[PDB]
Amino acid sequence: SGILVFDVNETLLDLTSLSPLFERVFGDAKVLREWFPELILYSQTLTLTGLYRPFGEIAAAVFEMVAANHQAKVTPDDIAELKTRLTSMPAYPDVAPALTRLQDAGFRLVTLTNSAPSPAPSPLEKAGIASFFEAHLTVHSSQRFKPHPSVYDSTAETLGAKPEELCMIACHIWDTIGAQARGWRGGFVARPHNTPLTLAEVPQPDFIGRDMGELADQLIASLTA
Amino acid sequence: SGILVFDVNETLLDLTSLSPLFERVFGDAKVLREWFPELILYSQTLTLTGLYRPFGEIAAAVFEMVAANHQAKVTPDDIAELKTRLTSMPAYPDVAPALTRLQDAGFRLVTLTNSAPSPAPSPLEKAGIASFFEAHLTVHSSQRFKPHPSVYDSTAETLGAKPEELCMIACHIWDTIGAQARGWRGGFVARPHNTPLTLAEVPQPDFIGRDMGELADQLIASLTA
Lengths: 225, 225
Prior knowledge:
Chain A folds into 2 domains: 1-14 and 88-225, Rossmann fold, CATH 3.40.50.1000; 15-87, DNA polymerase, domain 1. The first copy, chain A, contains 9 helices and 6 strands. Chain A has helices at 19-26, 32-49, 55-69, 76-86, 95-104, 123-126, 149-159, 173-180, 212-221; strands spanning 3-6, 108-113, 135-138, 166-170, 185-189, 207-209. Chain A has a 6-stranded parallel sheet with strand order 3-2-1-4-5-6, sandwiched between helices. In chain A, α8 links the parallel β4 (166-170) and β5 (185-189). Chains A and B meet through α2, α3 and α8 of A and α2, α3 and α8 of B.
């Protein structure tokens, strides 16, 4: 049927579980939506410039920067809470039902994350969904973040797969863009506060769902002519 | 003396002049600080995936995306206003004085922006500060956005300059990191809602100033051994 490569943070695991930390430190949970694109921004900046630190370290550094930008006090305990929450985000309820159906339709399932390899128990293990996946891959071996071509190419190589066999699934259009640039298909799931970017010459996702069940419907349906 | 290469948007020209558009369309001026890093994020994504569209086109697309994420109505007129405002940000009042001093101290002054080449009058001309600069350079000749190495390298080649002769001045640490990765010096100027990122093995700016006059003071002082 093919191999479906899933983004983890926000796509499978619920990022809004971080909201209480932002509420407390900033007086405003919506600061999550300023911090997160800054984290992705700086991960891509490190990659473009030939630098690498683990994603978690960038997350902490960016949280401190955004705090300073808001003149908000931040403590070592705040940074510890950020690490705690980022590594313990729960699975959305729509995930396990969808992954079950995808398996039964013949798809192989793997994950690919910017997050560095985790001590056991990993966030996916803690969320109870790790066992759906045959492999758990990270950008850590590449020392480059998404959407750098190395990340997708090394993932295809590791799986012994050609791009025509692969489909990247994410709620982040930057990730599907990255994979489609390497000849993979892209499947977009529309988690809250995520919309595709519509821009000339930017490829649109091959599949789209408002939730994981609807995306899985489209993937499975596509098998039958 | 040295060649000082200035970032334009937010560094020289006041990005908070866009606040009234965000207040009207979103009911929240703070959405500026969600939209701007998203714009930079997507400019880097396109660069990483081998695509180029003019910065202004990306800015319009990202404005439409952020509007959809907030369920905020956007019209053709709003996009026209974004264009008006983005291409006409006024200079901070600290800029002309500081540029005057730097010229007096014998520095050559150049601009380098992600924005595409502009019909006359340019944003810098409207702001009344274009004539301080011996060249006004853009990422157009590189077809890649900051901080990709091609942008800095093309700039050095265009100026007939060695990296050691160059200092990038910005209120965006991603821009100073980009330039310092190519052997330039970096000067950071604090602007509201911009502070440095501290991360192990990521280069820190060579100079830091709380505003442009203070940075200029330091750059000029450094000449006295």
